[PDB]
Amino acid sequence: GKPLTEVEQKAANGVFDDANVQNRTLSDWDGVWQSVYPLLQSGKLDPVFQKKADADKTKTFAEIKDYYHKGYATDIEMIGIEDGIVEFHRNNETTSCKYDYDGYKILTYKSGKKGVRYLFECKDPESKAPKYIQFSDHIIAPRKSSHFHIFMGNDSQQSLLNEMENWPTYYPYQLSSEEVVEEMMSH
Ligand SMILES: [Zn+2]
Fold this sequence. Notes:
Blueprint: H1 6-12, E1 31-35, H2 37-41, H3 46-55, H4 61-72, E2 76-82, E3 85-90, E4 93-98, E5 100-108, E6 114-121, E7 132-136, E8 148-153, H5 157-161, E9 169-172, H6 177-185
Antiparallel strand pairs: 1-2, 1-9, 2-3, 3-4, 5-6, 6-7, 7-8, 8-9
PDB class: metal binding protein
Keywords: Zinc binding protein, complex, citrate, metal binding protein
Assembly: monomeric
């Protein structure tokens, strides 16, 4: 999309006022999406971690790698979103649900930076998809997503709001692995 304004870039970096957060529709995440975890497993993110560790004098390669290893781990390799339906691919199995929007939640992290979770709920009794999902993607108002983090669970939304360590991360399926590492090198 368009380059971010200064205000949108600050929001992407976790700086914004609650009054500037707006609701979003599921279609902001329409598309087919690939988990980045297989890239981590295969060593393709080694240059990303080398770059971050060289730049942060307070962190070692191992500490950076372990952080993203915990962050990215998931067995959901692919997510498809279209026509109000999210489908999850785990090995050779698919589950899906027509998710209902339930608003957003503004979280404030230990650093004082903030982030917004967009909440959805599955109310289809015939579905085996996660009952609760939340999207987080460094965007706080309608805009098509470039990559997203998704929190999935079956117990409650608060349960997912408590999750800070694991944040399965998805880029568009149509990007090459080079192209994904490329985007990650710039973050
Ligand atoms: Zn991110």
